[PDB]
Amino acid sequence: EANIFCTFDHKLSIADVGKLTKLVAAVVPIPQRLHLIKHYQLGLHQFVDHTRGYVRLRGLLRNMTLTLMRRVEGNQILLHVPTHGLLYTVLNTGPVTWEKGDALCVLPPLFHGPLARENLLTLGQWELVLPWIVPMPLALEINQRLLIMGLFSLDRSYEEVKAAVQQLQTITFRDATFTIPDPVIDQHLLIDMKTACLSMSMVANLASELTMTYVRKLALEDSSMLLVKCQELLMRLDRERSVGEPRTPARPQHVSPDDEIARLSALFVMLRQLDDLIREQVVFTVCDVSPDNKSATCIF
């Protein structure tokens, strides 16, 4: 039920149990949610495949179950699935800083750049690869960035998308630089683009006629710095749409409070439908962070 026993077909030496005993309270993925499990399906090594799709690993990992590593004793592992709600502790090796207040998500790991490729467990051919535990803004940032990579790059030759993704794959998040290894397009990514286009078409349709011209009104009223950037973006989009002068707006005829309530509530529904592509639900809510940024206590 709760405590899940794993095993090993191979013996562990003192070095193997030594590097295993510093992996306590690390989260590992288990695909099965069964009791007497085996170590080859433990971790992501059976699922990792370069040149296959990062988004496939992402979807299977967010579909995988999670568990906590505690108390090896020699050819035994004692995985324990964390119950929903109770405070637990975690220990991450992903080179990303944390925070006492934010939330967490679980992502397939990227290469940091030093390229160590040693996660302190290897049994013959079999290795252990740990899923990165990532704070929530970096998680939604990498999600939206792979979504822009999939959405933009269709029907383009390799040079323009290369010039895009040499600066798009890099993310500097709290003095740490990360790059996405496998941005290759997927049929699942195609259905994400399908939901994306239908949602943005629907928010194009049932938006109010005043919100379609609101930024023109605020442009004619006030000049601020972000407003200057917004006028730059909107007028460049207008001159890419039409070389004519965009007319000033007058008194709007169809003013109706229930109409705005209904159409903007359906609009909020459709923005939820679009955001749930990239907005991943949380997995850990921090109660405390260790000062060396190795471990933490998270409530989930």
Partner: protein
């Protein structure tokens, strides 16, 4: 461990309800003096279009009562406005009843797998068809081994493409009618793969084809809408 909810239920809805496997749902009525009614999901069955007309005739012949009448009226006001009115409370323990915070009709139950996954979460799915006169709300109860919400929404879009194109047909044909969503996913808990028994049910000297779920752990979920 169980969270208790005691209920004062009138005698106008006690048909098909003395059994433990019942789910009461607090829907906001059109009338303001009770402000809500604890309807049963089997009353959501008779309104639904996906169910058989024989079970609908059974539900008519078992619910000739003014309480179910007025409840059907107050749910028949808003076209597809049910998710802005319906709000669940959990399963009945024992019937004036107690509730925690499991039987199901055979027709509205469905699966998209071979039900061999050991852990299986259960979900409620409404769908809003618009190729009928105004709206066909299809109720569905789904057991499945999937756990992550968004890939469940993607496989729901893969299975309900007719509902999606009917939704956008309603959007492009009736501009003055603004629909909110195709439906709502909401989980209720999970079962093991073994307790699902397709069996029979006899209540009020009336016959029914039921599917029982024994070890149903209950967890309340949010009405997460989806298109």
């Amino acid at each position: 461990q169980a969270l208790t909810a005691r209920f004062f239920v009138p005698e106008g809805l006690v048909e098909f309800e003395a059994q433990p496997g019942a789910l009461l749902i607090r829907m906001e009525t059109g009338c303001d003096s009770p402000r809500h009614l604890y309807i049963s999901l089997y009353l959501l069955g008779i309104r639904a279009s996906n169910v058989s007309a024989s079970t609908r005739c059974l539900l008519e012949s078992v619910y000739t009562a003014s309480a179910a009448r007025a409840a059907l009226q107050w749910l028949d006001l808003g076209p597809h406005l049910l998710h802005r009115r319906l709000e669940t409370l959990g399963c009945v323990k024992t019937v004036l009843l107690t509730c925690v915070m499991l039987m199901i009709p055979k027709d509205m139950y469905l699966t998209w797998e071979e039900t061999r996954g050991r852990l299986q979460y259960v979900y409620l799915i409404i769908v809003y068809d618009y190729d009928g006169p105004e709206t066909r709300p299809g109720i569905y109860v789904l057991t499945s081994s999937i756990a992550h919400w968004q890939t469940l929404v993607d496989v729901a879009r893969g299975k309900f493409a007719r509902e999606r194109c009917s939704f956008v047909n309603r959007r492009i044909t009736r501009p003055r009618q603004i629909p909110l969503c195709t439906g709502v996913i909401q989980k209720l808990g999970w079962c093991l793969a073994d307790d699902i028994h397709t069996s029979f049910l006899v209540h009020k000297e009336l016959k029914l084809s039921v599917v029982r779920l024994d070890n149903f752990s209950v967890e309340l979920g949010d009405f997460r809408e989806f298109v």
